[PDB]
């Protein structure tokens, strides 16, 4: 798997020291958050670790992983949900007869004997 | 067959002495047809092979994209303009360009922006093809495989060669058909499907010879 | 500023019929010659530059 | 009367061009100091 | 009209030119001076290196 | 004379200063005119020579076939259409295309039948030429001789070479004249004999320059 | 040589995406960007002939672009040419007054096209015969860069400056040939002079562009 950059030049992961290791980015800048106060269990191992844990909900690495499972599952579900909330409304407001419209009204559209129209973006409805 | 010395040729049986020496049936679709001797130099031969393959793929796409909208319009979909050589002018319509006629899809109204976006994206992808990019760097210039062969339909060498020959033959047919499209559009003035329907209506009178005197130089 | 004058409300045009009022500039003068005539215009009386 | 305008324009343009291209001719290195 | 005048005081013509010969004179003089400077540029020393010129 | 280093060239006194090195002068019609450098490779040179000779023979036949009907019509032969570039429409006439006017000769009516017959016949003939068939096999590609030289007019090798030079020169002249026919038909719109008669009538006034603003862009 | 425009480090026609140029395009000639995708210069003899053709075309097209632009500009400023537009200037000889240089009846005042054609044929035949084979203005000189009597000002004595000027010449010539192709296409399509097209584009760039004529050659 030998690749090149999108805009030419060498291709790869660029620099990964910004998100991993003792040197990394944090939820507060350097002048307001010294590296000494970072909790001991918040080391540069998990992805997207900004050393952010007020109130100390996490206690130690295995609980951190247990909560990481929930965080990742919630994140993926929320990505799908944001896409499915934004796209159909914009499609309906621009001319398509989605018949569901806004997300908080789609549920009641299928009450009684009512059905729902499904738009196959590229292809028909 | 289709490879080696005892392969199909461009003149059928009367082709033993017609094939040039440098065409030895090593590359797909090698019927030994170089009567003009334009690829005696092997480097020029390789460049022409690459040009032929790229032209064939683009012609396949063009033929399919010319056929599809006209048939869909015949099925009963309002395109605004279904004929292939008139489908570019609808960008200037008051309603813009709508994919499949649906007003909520694409709905493009500015031509300069579309041209600029096409220029940037196509330049990037063609540069990726020439030198390599996100998909890969050290692959065959014509058959990269890897990321461009997800289903893995080309893994056993004889099957790969047969598929390559099928590709080149379908591509040559597509190039011939697209040249026909161009000439028919210039001469007849109606869409290719309309031309086929007219020929089927009355073949004996609805042919090319009905337009023979169109370009008479009388003046 | 251009967006404010063109889409979000308008600007106070003092040359509007009667007393001036807020108006939307639907057709700004984008012609190169008209725009760049001001810069090379003389600064003395009658011309006044920009 | 337009000939006078042409002559004045020529003279002014010549002098202004002399001034402009004079300072482009590596002027900052014309000092007598050591550097 | 008693006499003839240029009639361009308040017209605000670009660069104060109302006849193409004036613009041609402007461009010709500027081009001649620029050509002389370009020819003589070889004696001023080339700043080809990235970090050159008077600085502190 | 002809073959040899001291041969006539295409630029006269200005040619010996710079001529291609690969044009030794062992072939007929070698005037040393390869300014574009398209025949550096000997195989491509051979293919180009073959193409040139085939065009030469076809253009000789074409020039005769263009001139003869118009001159005969001027002598008073009732032709359907004397001008060569309008002679193809005679098949669409109500009376059909008749040789020398008389309706008892040929009297062709259908264009499809004659086109199909020509396609089959010329396909067989050109396949035999390309590969070799009943009329000799393995012979000279350009000058088979034998059954194609019944009169034996080129048995003496020096006479054969001189006749080859005459053939190629007459062929180049014929191709030049046929290009002139095409351009004159495109521009003037009249037959070549009509063009000659008009030029002879008023040589200074009527000529090519008279139709100089013919293709000036509109709008 | 050792310069930015020669050697394996020369700039190439696809930027970083060009990859490796063809082997025969080693980069020893002016304006070598390694663009021979069609592979028409595999044979070195053909490469040399194509180089000669490119240089001659470049010089001719530079002259042609300048001669197409200048008279129309002068006519727009007020000079009374018979026909200022470049693709209409040839028809001036058919006018009753004949061709008049700069619009003056005492400049040239040509009347017959045949004499012009004959004298041009003779002079240009002699010129090109001298170009191919050495003549009075030098005999044993380079075909493309004779120098000598054709470089009176001595601008090509320094080999480094000679190479730099060769690159500049080839680049300006390629630009001129591109612009002359543009001249031809614009004359065929729009039907107005190049300066008229530029003025129309400047008047309203949004609408006065090429796409306005896009639906001009559609078949019906
Ligand atoms: C799992 C996340 C989820 C969320 C945040 C909501 C949210 C909502 N649902 Mg909903 N639903 C959700 C799952 C589902 N709903 C429905 C079927 C319905 C119906 C039939 C209705 C709702 C309605 C509602 C709304 C009640 C107020 C609210 C916007 C009501 C509504 O939209 O009233 C305006 C309503 O009538 N939902 C099904 C199929 C069984 C679901 C499957 O998980
Ligand atoms: C045995 C008989 C046989 C003959 C005669 C040919 C001959 C040909 N094959 Mg072949 N084949 C034959 C058997 C076989 N071929 C093939 C496989 C192939 C392939 C894959 C291909 C060919 C192609 C060709 C063509 C190549 C030369 C050409 O392009 O013609 C050009 C010249 C003509 C067609 C003659 C001109 C036509 C007409 C008489 C003139 C028309 C006049 C117009 C009215 C002009 C008016 C216009 C004016 C305004 C200027 C040629 C028609 C190639 C091809 O078809 O390209 C087009 C090609 O790709 N053959 C197989 C399978 C093994 C065969 C089996 O026997
Ligand atoms: C010594 C003088 C002499 C000169 C100048 C020439 C020159 C020529 N000879 Mg040569 N010959 C000469 C002596 C001899 N020739 C020959 C034997 C031959 C042969 C067998 C042949 C030639 C040919 C040629 C032509 C090569 C084509 C070319 O270079 O295109 C450059 C020339 C032009 C482009 C002419 C341009 C004419 C005009 C100035 C331009 C036209 C302007 C238009 C109005 C433009 C309008 C634009 C339109 C299209 C929109 C060329 C005219 C070949 C030929 O005839 O090809 C045509 C050829 O086959 N010569 C012999 C016998 C030994 C000679 C004896 O001295
Ligand atoms: C006053 C306001 C007027 C109104 C507003 C007008 C706005 C105009 C904006 C555009 C122009 C701005 C120019 C500002 C002045 C700075 C010019 C400059 O620093 O320029 C410095 C650079 C230096 O160039 C470098 O110069 C180097 C040194 O060269 C020397 O050495 C070389 C070998 O190393 C060669 O031997 C060469 O021959 C030799 O001269 C190299 O050559 C480099 O390759 C080369 O890039 O020049 C260059 O940028 C290239 C030239 C730039 C454009 C110049 C246009 C001049 C006018 C053209 C039309 C004239 C028409 C005349 C008609 C007459 C008849 C009627
Ligand atoms: C010209 C303005 C400017 C510049 C160049 C910098 C540059 C820097 N600051 Mg300083 N800073 C600024 C303004 C500026 N700051 C202001 C206005 C505040 C008050 C909120 C601070 C408060 C601040 C702190 C407390 C710290 C820094 C730190 C830093 C350094 C690294 C972190 C960083 O980029 O800031 C991060 C700043 C932010 C994330 C603020 C949010 C900025 C977003 C992008 C909003 C941008 C708004 C928009 C682009 C402009 C609005 C225009 C108009 C409304 C005014 C860096 C040298 C750190 C440092 O050096 O540590 C030793 C550090 O600890 N800055
Ligand atoms: C977990 C997320 C989620 C959920 C619960 C839904 C649920 C729904 N979507 Mg949404 N949708 C989602 C993600 C989601 N979608 C995403 C990621 C996209 C973008 C690709 C869309 C784009 C989309 C469109 C464009 C439309 C829906 C529609 C619908 C409804 C009918 C779907 C159906 O029968 O298709 C059956 C599909 C079988 C494969 C249903 C309420 C339809 C609707 O009625 O809108 C209100 C409709 O038109 N969805
Ligand atoms: C390189 C070939 C090529 C080119 C240049 C064009 C160019 C064009 N096409 Mg054609 N087309 C092609 C191939 C091509 N097409 C093929 C192969 C098909 C068959 C699927 C079609 C089917 C087609 C239809 C049905 C329509 C067009 C339309 C258009 C015009 C609008 C372009 C646009 O907005 O698309 C960009 C659109 C989007 C980015 C929106 C998403 C659409 C996605 C990309 C479609 C992807 C299809 C998929 C990959 C292949 C089919 C899958 C199937 C087997 C399940 C434009 C003139 C439209 C038009 O103007 O009508 C005349 C129109 O209605 N084309
Ligand atoms: C299609 C016809 C044809 C072909 C294949 C050739 C091929 C050849 N000729 Mg012949 N020739 C022709 C026509 C042709 N010529 C005509 C019409 C004339 C008279 C003007 C001549 C006069 C001539 C002489 C005097 C000599 C040759 C020579 C050669 C050989 C080297 C030149 C070369 O590379 O040509 C390659 C040719 C092509 C690749 C054809 C491309 C044609 C393109 C499409 C341009 C055609 C249109 C063009 C604008 C017409 C301009 C002139 C017009 C006014 C007629 C080569 C075998 C030389 C040689 O070595 O003899 C053996 C030689 O001394 N030829
Ligand atoms: C020290 C403090 C400086 C403070 C500067 C404050 C800002 C000043 C802004 C001036 C804007 C000028 C815009 C262009 C002016 C212009 O085009 O003039 C154009 C004017 C107009 O000229 C007249 O125009 C009239 C109206 O059409 C008529 O046509 C007249 O015939 C014509 O003569 O010409 C002049 O006034 C003279 C200009 C040249 C004066 C000498 C300049 C020397 C500069 C030396 C340094 C160069 C670097
Ligand atoms: C590189 C490459 C590579 C790959 O591989 C392949 C390929 C692609 C093929 C290639 C490419 C190529 C190209 C692009 C080409 C082009 C060319 C041109 C355009 C030329 C022109 C060219 C052009 C030219 C010469 C021009 C010229 C002109 C002229 C003379 C003019 C004249 C004139 C004038 C003054 C004016 C007046 O009133 C008239 C007259 C008299 C008319």
Q: What is the DSSP string of F174-215?
A: HHHHHHHHHHHHHHT-S-HHHHHHHHHHSTTTSSGGGGSSTT
CB B28, CB B159: distance < 8 Å: no
CB G32, CB G165: distance < 8 Å: no
Query: What region does F146 belong to: left with phi over 0, alpha with psi -120 to 50, or beta?
Result: left
Ligand approaching nearest to the C-alpha of G92: 10
- Alpha-carbon distances of D27 from D16, D19, D24, rounded to whole Å: 16, 12, 7
CB A64, CB A46: distance < 8 Å: yes
F88 is in an annotated binding site: yes
Judged by CB atoms closer than 8 Å, whether chains meet at B14 and F127 is answered as: yes
Question: Ligand 9 centre and the CA of D22: distance in Å?
Answer: 20
Pull the structure tokens for residue C39.
Answer: 């810069």
Task: Return the DSSP state at C26.
Answer: S
In angstroms, the CA G163 to CA G5 distance is 9
In angstroms, the CA D22 to CA E40 distance is 12
Cβ neighbours of G17 in A, within 8 Å: 8
- Count interface pairs C-G at CB distance under 8 A: 4
Breakpoints of chain G, after residues (C–N > 2.5 Å): none
Give the residue among F102, F70, F108, F71 at the shortest CA–CA distance from F89: F108
What residues have CB less than 8 Å from A90, skipping those under 6 apart? Answer: none
Give the residue among F58, F60, F85 at the shortest CA–CA distance from F70: F85
Residue nearest to atom 65 of ligand 8 (CA): F33
Contact between chain D and chain B (3 or more Cβ pairs less than 8 Å apart): no
Rounded to 5°, angle at Cα G135 from G130 and G139: 115
Question: Ligand 2 centre and the CA of F119: distance in Å?
Answer: 10
In angstroms, the CA F193 to CA A20 distance is 90
Question: Ligand 1 centre and the CA of B102: distance in Å?
Answer: 30
**Within a 10 A sphere around the Cβ of B84, how many other Cβ atoms?**
20
Q: Say if residue B92 is exposed, middle or buried (CB neighbours under 10 Å; 0-12, 13-18, 19+).
A: middle
Tokens 């069609």, located at residue: G38
Give the residue among F45, F43, F35, F32 at the shortest CA–CA distance from F5: F32
Judged by CB atoms closer than 8 Å, whether chains meet at F131 and B209 is answered as: no
Pull the structure tokens for residue G44.
Answer: 């070195």
CB A103, CB A89: distance < 8 Å: yes
In angstroms, the CA C11 to CA B121 distance is 39
Pull the structure tokens for residue F88.
Answer: 């193809």
Question: Ligand 1 centre and the CA of A118: distance in Å?
Answer: 17
In angstroms, the CA B183 to CA B179 distance is 6
The radius of gyration of chain G from alpha carbons, rounded to an integer in Å, stands at 22
Of C40, C45, C46, the CB nearest to E15: C40
Q: Which helix (H) or strand (E) holds A103?
A: helix A103-109
Phi, psi of A31 (to 5 degrees): -70, -25
Q: Say if residue B34 is exposed, middle or buried (CB neighbours under 10 Å; 0-12, 13-18, 19+).
A: buried
The set of long-range contacts for B27-36, using a CB threshold of 8 Å and a minimum separation of 24, is B28/B2, B28/B161, B28/B164, B28/B165, B28/B167, B28/B168, B29/B165, B29/B168, B29/B169, B29/B172, B30/B3, B31/B7, B33/B9, B35/F47, B35/F130, B36/F47, B36/F51
- Count interface pairs A-B at CB distance under 8 A: 39
Residue F138's SS3 state is coil
In angstroms, the CA B79 to CA B86 distance is 11
Question: Chain G, 160-219: which have a CB under 8 Å from a chain C CB?
Answer: 202-204
Q: Kindly state if the Cβ of E7 falls inside 6 Å of ligand 9.
A: no
In angstroms, the CA G30 to CA G39 distance is 19
Q: Which helix (H) or strand (E) holds C35?
A: helix C32-40
- Which residues is G99 bridged to in the sheet? G110
Alpha-carbon distance E8 to nearest alpha carbon in chain C (angstroms): 10
Please state the separation of Cα B89 from the chain's center in Å.
Answer: 22
Beta strands in D1-35 (DSSP E): none
Alpha helices in G78-136 (DSSP H): 113-132
G129 is in an annotated binding site: no
In angstroms, the CA B111 to CA B122 distance is 16
- Closest ligand 6 atom number to CA of residue A83: 17
Ligand approaching nearest to the C-alpha of D8: 9
User: What is the DSSP secondary-structure string of A26-57?
Assistant: -SS-TTTS-GGGS-TT--TTSTT-----GGG-
Taking each helix axis as running N to C, give the angle between helix F157-187 and helix F192-201, from 0 to 180 degrees, rounded to the nearest 10.
80
In angstroms, the CA E19 to CA E10 distance is 16
SS3 content of chain F, % helix, strand, coil (to 5): 55, 0, 45
In angstroms, the CA F28 to CA F1 distance is 11
Task: Return the DSSP state at B136.
Answer: -
Q: Kindly state if the Cβ of A84 falls inside 6 Å of ligand 6.
A: yes
In angstroms, the CA G209 to CA E24 distance is 29
Cβ neighbours of E12 in C, within 8 Å: 37, 41-42, 46-47
The radius of gyration of chain F from alpha carbons, rounded to an integer in Å, stands at 22
In angstroms, the CA E29 to CA D11 distance is 9
What residues have CB less than 8 Å from B187, skipping those under 6 apart? Answer: B208, B211, B214
Tokens 């002259």, located at residue: G63
Cβ neighbours of E30 in D, within 8 Å: 13, 17
Give the residue among F118, F120, F140, F114 at the shortest CA–CA distance from F129: F140
Ligand approaching nearest to the C-alpha of E26: 4
Of D1, D9, D26, the CB nearest to E45: D26
Tokens 């409304």, located at residue: A89
Pull the structure tokens for residue E40.
Answer: 């003589």
CB A52, CB A27: distance < 8 Å: yes
In angstroms, the CA G28 to CA G44 distance is 13
Q: Which residues line ligand 10 (CB under 6 A)?
A: G 35-38, 40, 57, 60-61, 64, 67-68, 86, 89, 177, 180-181
Please state the separation of Cα G215 from the chain's center in Å.
Answer: 30
What residues have CB less than 8 Å from G110, skipping those under 6 apart? Answer: G93, G98, G99, G116
Q: Kindly state if the Cβ of A104 falls inside 6 Å of ligand 1.
A: yes
Pull the structure tokens for residue G127.
Answer: 């010129």
Rounded to 5°, angle at Cα A12 from A9 and A17: 115
Q: Kindly state if the Cβ of F11 falls inside 6 Å of ligand 3.
A: yes
- Which residues is C13 bridged to in the sheet? C21
Pull the structure tokens for residue B209.
Answer: 């010879």
Cβ neighbours of F186 in B, within 8 Å: 217
Give the residue among B162, B124, B212 at the shortest CA–CA distance from B7: B162
Ligand approaching nearest to the C-alpha of F27: 8
Give the residue among F49, F58, F59, F56 at the shortest CA–CA distance from F140: F49
In angstroms, the CA F108 to CA F96 distance is 6
A27 is in an annotated binding site: yes
CB C27, CB C13: distance < 8 Å: no
**Within a 10 A sphere around the Cβ of B125, how many other Cβ atoms?**
12
Residue G10's SS3 state is coil
In angstroms, the CA A23 to CA F213 distance is 78
Method: cryo-EM
End-to-end CA distance of chain B: 55
Of B99, B104, B137, the CB nearest to A3: B137
Cβ neighbours of B39 in F, within 8 Å: none
Pull the structure tokens for residue B181.
Answer: 């499209």
In angstroms, the CA A96 to CA A123 distance is 12
CB B43, CB G39: distance < 8 Å: yes
- Alpha-carbon distances of B47 from F39, F121, F128, G8, rounded to whole Å: 19, 36, 32, 22
- Alpha-carbon distances of A25 from C16, C50, F84, rounded to whole Å: 56, 49, 85
What residues have CB less than 8 Å from G72, skipping those under 6 apart? Answer: G84, G85, G86, G193, G194, G195
Alpha-carbon distance D10 to nearest alpha carbon in chain E (angstroms): 7
In angstroms, the CA B179 to CA B56 distance is 12
Alpha-carbon distance G147 to nearest alpha carbon in chain A (angstroms): 43
Residue of D nearest to E22 (CA): D6
Residues of B with CB under 8 A from a CB of F: 11, 14-18, 20, 22, 35-38, 40-41, 209, 212-213, 216-219
């Amino acid at each position: 798997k030998a690749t090149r950059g999108w805009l030419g030049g060498q291709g790869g992961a660029a620099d990964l020291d910004k998100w991993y290791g003792p040197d990394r980015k944090l939820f507060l800048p350097s002048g307001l958050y010294d590296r000494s106060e970072i909790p001991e269990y918040l080391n540069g191992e998990l992805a997207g670790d900004y050393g952010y844990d007020p109130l100390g909900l996490g206690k130690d690495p295995e609980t951190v992983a247990k909560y990481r499972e929930n965080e990742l599952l919630h994140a993926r579900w929320a990505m799908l949900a944001a896409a499915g909330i934004l796209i159909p409304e914009g499609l309906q407001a621009n001319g398509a007869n989605i018949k569901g419209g806004t997300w908080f009204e789609t549920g009641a559209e299928m009450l009684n004997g009512g059905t729902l129209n499904y738009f196959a973006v590229p292809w028909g409805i | 067959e289709f490879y080696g010395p005892n392969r199909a040729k461009w003149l059928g049986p009367y082709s033993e002495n017609a094939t040039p020496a440098y065409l030895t049936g090593e590359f797909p679709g090698d019927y030994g047809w170089d009567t003009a001797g334009l690829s005696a130099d092997p480097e020029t031969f390789k460049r022409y092979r690459e040009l032929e393959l790229i032209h064939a793929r683009w012609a396949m796409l063009g033929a399919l994209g010319c056929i599809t909208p006209e048939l869909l319009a015949k099925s009963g979909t309002q395109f605004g303009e279904a004929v292939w050589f008139k489908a570019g002018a609808q960008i200037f319509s008051e309603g813009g360009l709508d994919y499949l006629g649906n007003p909520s899809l694409v709905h493009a109204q500015n031509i300069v922006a579309t041209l600029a976006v096409q220029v940037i994206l196509m330049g990037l992808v063609e540069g990726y093809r020439v030198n390599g990019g996100p998909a890969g760097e050290g692959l065959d210039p014509l058959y990269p495989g890897e990321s461009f062969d997800p289903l893995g339909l080309a893994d056993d060498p004889d099957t790969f060669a047969e598929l390559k020959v099928k590709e080149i033959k379908n591509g040559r047919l597509a190039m011939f058909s697209m040249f026909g499209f161009f000439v028919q559009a210039i001469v007849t003035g109606k869409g290719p499907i309309q031309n086929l329907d007219d020929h089927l209506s009355n073949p004996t009178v609805n042919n090319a010879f009905a337009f023979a005197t169109k370009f008479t130089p009388s003046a | 500023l251009v967006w404010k004058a063109m889409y979000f409300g308008g600007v106070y045009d003092t040359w509007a019929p009667g007393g001036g009022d807020v108006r939307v500039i639907t057709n700004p003068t984008t012609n190169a010659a008209v725009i760049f005539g001001y810069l090379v215009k003389s600064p003395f009386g009658g011309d006044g530059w920009i | 009367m337009l000939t006078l305008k042409i002559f004045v324009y020529t003279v002014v343009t010549f002098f202004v061009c002399l001034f402009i291209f004079g300072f482009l001719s590596n002027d900052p290195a014309r000092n007598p100091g050591k550097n | 009209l008693v006499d003839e005048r240029m009639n361009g005081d308040g017209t605000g013509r670009p660069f104060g030119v109302n006849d193409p010969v004036l613009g041609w004179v402007l461009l010709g003089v500027f081009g001649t001076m620029w050509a002389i400077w370009f020819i003589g540029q070889k004696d001023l020393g080339d700043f080809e290196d990235a970090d050159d010129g008077l600085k502190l």
